[PDB]
Design a protein around this ligand. Structure first.
Ligand SMILES: [Mg+2]
Ligand SMILES: [Mg+2]
Ligand SMILES: [Mg+2]
Ligand SMILES: [Mg+2]
Ligand SMILES: [Mg+2]
Ligand SMILES: [Mg+2]
Ligand SMILES: [Mg+2]
Ligand SMILES: [Mg+2]
Ligand SMILES: [Mg+2]
Ligand SMILES: [Mg+2]
Ligand SMILES: [Mg+2]
Ligand SMILES: [Mg+2]
Ligand SMILES: [Mg+2]
Ligand SMILES: [Mg+2]
Ligand SMILES: [Mg+2]
Ligand SMILES: [Mg+2]
Ligand SMILES: [Mg+2]
Ligand SMILES: [Mg+2]
Ligand SMILES: [Mg+2]
Ligand SMILES: [Mg+2]
Ligand SMILES: [Mg+2]
Ligand SMILES: [Mg+2]
Ligand SMILES: [Mg+2]
Ligand SMILES: [Mg+2]
Ligand SMILES: [Mg+2]
Ligand SMILES: [Mg+2]
Ligand SMILES: [Mg+2]
Ligand SMILES: [Mg+2]
Ligand SMILES: [Mg+2]
Ligand SMILES: [Mg+2]
Ligand SMILES: [Mg+2]
Ligand SMILES: [Mg+2]
Ligand SMILES: [Mg+2]
Ligand SMILES: [Mg+2]
Ligand SMILES: [Mg+2]
Ligand SMILES: [Mg+2]
Ligand SMILES: [Mg+2]
Ligand SMILES: [Mg+2]
Ligand SMILES: [Mg+2]
Ligand SMILES: [Mg+2]
Ligand SMILES: [Mg+2]
Ligand SMILES: [Mg+2]
Ligand SMILES: [Mg+2]
Ligand SMILES: [Mg+2]
Ligand SMILES: [Mg+2]
Ligand SMILES: [Mg+2]
Ligand SMILES: [Mg+2]
Ligand SMILES: [Mg+2]
Ligand SMILES: [Mg+2]
Ligand SMILES: [Mg+2]
Ligand SMILES: [Mg+2]
Ligand SMILES: [Mg+2]
Ligand SMILES: [Mg+2]
Ligand SMILES: [Mg+2]
Ligand SMILES: [Mg+2]
Ligand SMILES: [Mg+2]
Ligand SMILES: [Mg+2]
Lengths: 112, 49, 118, 101, 143
RNA sequence: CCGAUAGUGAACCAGUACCGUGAGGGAAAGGUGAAAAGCACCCCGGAAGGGGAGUGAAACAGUUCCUGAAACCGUGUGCCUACAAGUAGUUAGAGCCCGUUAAUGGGUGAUAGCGUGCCUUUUGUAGAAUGAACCGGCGAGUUACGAUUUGUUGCAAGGUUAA
RNA sequence: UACUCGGGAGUCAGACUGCGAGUGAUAAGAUCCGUAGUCGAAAGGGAAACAGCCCAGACCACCAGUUAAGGUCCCCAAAUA
RNA sequence: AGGUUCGUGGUAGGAGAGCGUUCUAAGGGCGGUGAAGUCAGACCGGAAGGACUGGUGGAGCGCUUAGAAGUGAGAAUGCCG
């Protein structure tokens, strides 16, 4: 019946380009190994992607009754969200735009 | 008269000519006014005499 | 009564973009750039319908020449023999025999030599 | 055998059973069209015409009268506000070759 | 419609041995540049390589009419400021006969990607013995 | 007559927020659903946010919520690409992959020929002259009263009313 | 084809080449006239590229033919006449 | 309605025939068995353009003959997002 489970994180306050650089490491790897990868990569997006990947595992066994020991990661992508627009006062009475960008993170785990 | 079949007399009505609607109509960019004169400006020309 | 523009501008612009399918970069995405490429492609295509007829005739001539030299002749001195003998086969058919049915090409070339001598 | 016939202002090399496209001719579907302008007959022999082979003919049968795909002839001159658009669909006649004489 | 076009590998490519003693430099090169091109076959196709392989022996006996042995100059620039170097045709024939015939023919071939392909089809030897006896070439008589 | 860049500056706590010492200048911002029936309950998490369950015709209608185009940013994959000098196409064309509003069909294209963007202004611009970052909406010969000329209709040595 | 009457315009910065002159130095892709052509408002083929030079005026389609200026050893179609 | 002859490069500009948009009047229509809108196709006409089929959408919209115009945008160091 159900072969895969997913979890998303809508509107996380991290720029999409910065979170997209850690996602590329865990694409195609087993869930046991991928969790360790995010543990030893000293970036700011690791605690966020780690907390999403674990959630996808959790409802992969409570909702669909899969095996935690036989899962891989097949789909993992980061989408853009509603950016916040701010300003920074520069010299000589001018102002400059600052974009506070958010992101959506999706992780899909399935049997192999 | 069958108001769904009105047909006016032939030649009694013509069609307005609208300038400045593309170059396929022959009256496009400059709209029959030429190039860069006093007569080519808004409200141009000289008096009658 | 007011006439607000709508469903008419994008209908015409989208048609031009779809005609620019397969172009590199923004030339298949953006209207302003894609309009200039569609106009330019038509101008090219118009004048290659003229060059296509010239390009092929140069191809048939170079193939009749190569086949005619194997029989102690040349293109200029072969095509003179045929006219002087009355044969009206054009270049497209003559090149076809020289590649596929070279046996009949020699029969035509023999008549060309007879016309030149007599 | 094969023959070289002239039709529509240009020549085509033809074979029995072959199915060709030529310019528009006269006749409804099913009519038998005879070609009398034959230039060369080959196969185990050769018959060259000067210019036409006397008495030889090719017999065919029309199958479809239609038009080709739609072109779009377009022209323009830069900086001069001149463009011109026009579509084209060239008619044709489709034939099947019955026998060669 | 129906016009024959060759395909890569459809046409048999031969090997030819050309003896180049006493022949003028440009009279030899002109005929060789059309053997590699494929302009002697009715199977000619402009966009497909369909020529022959050519081996040239006795490259040191090539002909240079007139005062070409001293007044003909070959130039090279290294793209460094003031780096123009020159060699006469006479001493080039004496020392490097293989380079003289390759430079002449290379300018007689199309200047495109396929024109480089035909260049790799040419082997020039200054002596009278070639190393390609395993390919079994034939003797080609110049017209 | 307009239908949310339109119609009042203002369809919404608008002469408000904001700017100026002051006179004064002056915005942006409409739509869940028929009915809140606005997601008891279980799992990951500090929470946010999710995955099931349930209400509903619809949850890809879940408190900027009808519809949701384009620029812009991603994931997967059929064809091509690391000896090549490219206004990026067009014509010729092999190979590989498909199968349509069914017809001398579709996608990509090794290699070959030809090929110096669009507008404006100029004797003359690929121009090292000017304008445009891209996408979307808005944006320029109209009306009133008179003059003259052509066409049509009614009457005709007559025609026609204004207030 | 002219001519007459009537409705509607645009233009008054021209450029080069051959011939006849002026100013200039019997210089200028100079300047100013008369006369013919082309460009402007003209694509196509030849002059390597090259508005004005030479041939010649594109209604559309054809994998048909004969020619003009210019050419026929290779790049590049045709005479190693 | 059919033939014969001569033609059909084009800037400023003149003349003619038309497509499409919003609204109004009459006739005649389709639509919860799915309207407009939107996305994709290899269809049709000489052009502006017009159908058909399928997905999304969830309530209005075409056709014919006339009439009236806030009537068609790629450029204004154009205004707004
Ligand atoms: Mg300041
Ligand atoms: Mg300050
Ligand atoms: Mg009109
Ligand atoms: Mg005009
Ligand atoms: Mg314009
Ligand atoms: Mg102007
Ligand atoms: Mg003027
Ligand atoms: Mg309205
Ligand atoms: Mg608009
Ligand atoms: Mg492509
Ligand atoms: Mg408003
Ligand atoms: Mg709206
Ligand atoms: Mg205050
Ligand atoms: Mg409501
Ligand atoms: Mg939930
Ligand atoms: Mg908890
Ligand atoms: Mg919750
Ligand atoms: Mg659910
Ligand atoms: Mg239900
Ligand atoms: Mg629904
Ligand atoms: Mg429903
Ligand atoms: Mg509703
Ligand atoms: Mg929405
Ligand atoms: Mg989109
Ligand atoms: Mg390579
Ligand atoms: Mg189908
Ligand atoms: Mg190319
Ligand atoms: Mg100037
Ligand atoms: Mg200026
Ligand atoms: Mg600029
Ligand atoms: Mg814009
Ligand atoms: Mg007049
Ligand atoms: Mg004067
Ligand atoms: Mg003057
Ligand atoms: Mg003058
Ligand atoms: Mg002079
Ligand atoms: Mg001058
Ligand atoms: Mg001057
Ligand atoms: Mg003229
Ligand atoms: Mg002009
Ligand atoms: Mg010209
Ligand atoms: Mg020219
Ligand atoms: Mg020159
Ligand atoms: Mg040229
Ligand atoms: Mg020009
Ligand atoms: Mg003409
Ligand atoms: Mg001839
Ligand atoms: Mg040749
Ligand atoms: Mg005309
Ligand atoms: Mg007019
Ligand atoms: Mg109705
Ligand atoms: Mg409407
Ligand atoms: Mg629909
Ligand atoms: Mg319609
Ligand atoms: Mg409509
Ligand atoms: Mg308007
Ligand atoms: Mg802006």
């Amino acid at each position: 019946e159900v072969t895969s489970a997913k979890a998303v994180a809508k509107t996380v306050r991290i720029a999409p380009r910065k979170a997209r650089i850690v996602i590329d490491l865990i694409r195609g790897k087993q869930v046991g190994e991928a969790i360790a990868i995010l543990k030893y990569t000293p970036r700011s997006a690791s605690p966020i992607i780690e907390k999403v990947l674990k959630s996808a595992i959790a409802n992969a066994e409570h909702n669909y009754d899969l095996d935690i020991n036989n899962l891989v990661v097949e789909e993992a992508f980061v989408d853009e969200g509603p950016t916040l627009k701010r300003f920074r006062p520069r010299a000589q009475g001018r102002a400059s735009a600052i974009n506070k960008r958010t992101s959506h993170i999706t992780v899909v785990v399935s049997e192999v | 008269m069958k108001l769904h079949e009105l047909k006016p007399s032939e030649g009694s009505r013509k069609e307005r000519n609208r300038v400045g609607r593309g170059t396929g109509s022959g009256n496009g960019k400059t709209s029959g006014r030429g190039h860069k004169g006093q007569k080519a400006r808004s409200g141009g020309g000289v008096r009658l005499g | 009564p007011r006439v607000k523009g709508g469903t008419v501008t994008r209908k015409r612009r989208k048609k031009i973009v779809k005609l620019a399918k397969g172009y590199y970069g923004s030339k298949h995405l953006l209207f302003k750039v894609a309009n200039q490429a569609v106009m330019k492609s038509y101008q090219y295509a118009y004048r290659d319908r003229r060059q296509k007829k010239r390009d092929f005739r140069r191809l048939w001539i170079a193939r009749i020449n190569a086949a005619a030299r194997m029989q102690d002749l040349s293109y200029s001195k072969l095509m003179h023999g045929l006219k002087l003998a009355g044969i009206d086969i054009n270049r497209k058919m003559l090149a076809d025999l020289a590649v596929n049915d070279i046996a009949s090409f020699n029969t035509l070339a023999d008549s060309a030599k007879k016309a030149l001598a007599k | 055998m094969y023959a070289i016939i002239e039709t529509g202002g240009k020549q085509i090399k033809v074979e029995a059973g072959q199915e060709i496209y030529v310019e528009k001719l006269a006749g409804e579907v099913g009519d038998v069209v005879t070609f009398d302008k034959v230039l060369f007959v080959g196969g185990d022999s050769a018959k060259v015409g000067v210019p036409f082979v006397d008495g030889a003919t090719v017999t065919a049968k029309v199958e479809k009268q239609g038009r080709a795909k739609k072109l779009t002839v377009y022209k323009y001159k830069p900086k001069k506000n001149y463009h011109k658009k026009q579509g084209h669909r060239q008619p044709y006649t489709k034939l099947t070759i019955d026998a060669i004489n | 419609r129906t016009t024959y076009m060759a395909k890569p590998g459809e046409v048999e490519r031969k090997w030819y041995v050309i003896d180049a003693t006493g022949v003028s430099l440009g009279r030899l090169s002109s005929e060789v540049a059309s053997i590699l091109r494929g302009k002697n076959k009715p199977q000619f196709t402009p966009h497909i390589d369909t020529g022959d392989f050519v081996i040239i022996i006795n490259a040191g006996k090539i002909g240079l009419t007139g005062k070409k042995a001293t007044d003909k100059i070959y130039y090279r620039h290294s793209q460094y400021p003031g780096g123009l170097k020159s060699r006469t045709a006479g001493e080039m024939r004496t020392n490097n006969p293989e380079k003289l015939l390759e430079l002449s023919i290379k300018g007689m071939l199309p200047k495109n990607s396929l024109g480089r392909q035909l260049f790799k089809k040419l082997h020039v030897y200054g002596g009278s013995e070639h190393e390609h006896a395993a390919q079994k070439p034939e003797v080609y008589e110049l017209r």
